[PDB]
Amino acid sequence: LTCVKSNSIWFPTSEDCPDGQNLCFKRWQYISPRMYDFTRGCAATCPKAEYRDVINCCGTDKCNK
């Protein structure tokens, strides 16, 4: 599986997922009313979304743009 990857170290790019990580995720973490951290990458499992920790996942190549 290949996913879009973007985080504190990576400008948007693509990652070939480590074996056993078969999900691509998009995640938003609340910092303040007008600020959040947006990240993208590979994952093994998808936790439930919450208001301040919003996540969605998918299992097709680069489906997490």
Domain boundaries, the chain: 1-65
Contacts of 14 (CB under 8 A, 6+ apart): 2, 3, 4, 5, 62
* Resolution of the entry in angstroms: 1.4
Rounded CA separation 10/59 (Å)? 21
Element (DSSP H or E) covering residue 37: strand 35-43
The CATH-assigned architecture of domain 1-65 is: Ribbon (2.10)
Give φ, ψ of 56 to 5 degrees: -135, 155
Instruction: Please name the method used to determine this structure.
Output: X-ray
Rounded CA separation 57/12 (Å)? 17
